[PDB]
Unconditional design. Sequence first.
Lengths: 85, 83, 29
Amino acid sequence: IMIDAASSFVLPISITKNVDVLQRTDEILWFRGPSVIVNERIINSGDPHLSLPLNRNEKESLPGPFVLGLRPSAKFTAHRLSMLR
Amino acid sequence: NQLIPQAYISNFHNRLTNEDDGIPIFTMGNAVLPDLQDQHHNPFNILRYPKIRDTFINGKVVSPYRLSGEAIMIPITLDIEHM
Amino acid sequence: FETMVANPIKVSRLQSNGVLTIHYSLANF
């Protein structure tokens, strides 16, 4: 198991004409491995569909992942904006 | 560290032979000295003056020398040409 | 296009941990 590997490669031909959305050096960084997509960094460990209680085949499509993201209500945000000035 | 020492600068004879100061010994903002303006307590800000950076550059290293009821004042003149 | 190997960019851990960013301190004339 090695730690001090390079894991970064840049092609010498500069085709930096229409490339401004990627991660530039400031050239294009090319890794040895792909990227990973994480939807929400917070996990609601309640919400008993995930915790599976032992009391009582059912399908249910919940609206959006934001149930599992601890999203606050807009009234507290409006109250904090009223407390801002 | 980062302290300027007290001694070992004696750039005096080059100012005696600088040919611009009013010295009759040898023949052959807008202020010059920052004794009224601050440098924000930084040493490098003293290097912008030409009469001080000349002292820092053209200095030399010397060695320290170690050594009646009515006074009679007699003026003594001196006039000797040499080299 | 398959003969276009690139240049590796090293980590330089001793230059990654605590490198800073001497005539500026007046002690060497």
